[PDB]
Amino acid sequence: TKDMGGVIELKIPSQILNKAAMDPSSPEADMVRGLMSDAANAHSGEQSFFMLPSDTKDNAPQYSMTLKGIDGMGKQYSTAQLISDRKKSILDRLGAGFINVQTIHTQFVQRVN
């Protein structure tokens, strides 16, 4: 559930964000409210695209849009095979470990009889 790979991140100058918070009836407020709904609905389809201003103030740009990813290496322990070992560990005590694939199971039943 928490593997947010490829999530959308948006960067906006704080002048617009701050103006909207203090002026609910200003043009900045309308555009901010539009972004909060448009970005939630941003799927992939027949008309998906992005258009951002290209202004620049420093070495970094004013507006940007990037898709995040894990900056490094992911998980290593492969929890899948941990569970399989423990399941065979439990069923072996009951003689029913063959489901993980005269027998052991038949001989085990004779003990109870």
């Binding site: 704080s14 701050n18 901010v32 939630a40 799927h43 027949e46």
Partner: protein, 160 residues
Amino acid sequence: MTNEQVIELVRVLLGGITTEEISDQTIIFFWTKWKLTYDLDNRPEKIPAALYNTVVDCVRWLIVQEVSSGNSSIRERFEKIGDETISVKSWESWKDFLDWLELNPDYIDPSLAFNSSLVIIGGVRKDEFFRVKNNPNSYNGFMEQGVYPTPAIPKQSAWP
């Protein structure tokens, strides 16, 4: 607020600016501009908002006052009418103050609700999730009709 308090409050905020530098008429001109756009008499909730814009507009008029005159383009002077000699060298100072003032609105009124909604994360609130979902104009990913429409795909965002 009345027409007389605005001048009294603006001058104190601007560090006791004099009358010749900014007339009381010009202050009223910008004050009246925001009164009609924000109908302060009808709704008094915009008193901090109208006050903040009024002070900023006054600073803008102060900057353009240095321009359109000889003060902006000169950076030396020399007088001598005999033995008296004088040599000295606000357009540049008013610039950064406007940038600083735009970043510290609490200096005018603490109740401006400044700096509250910087970071937005979607899908983590029920109020916002249903607002987008129930919007009749919303178009989401579950509406992908393909080559031609089929009755197996919804045409509305809200759940039945």
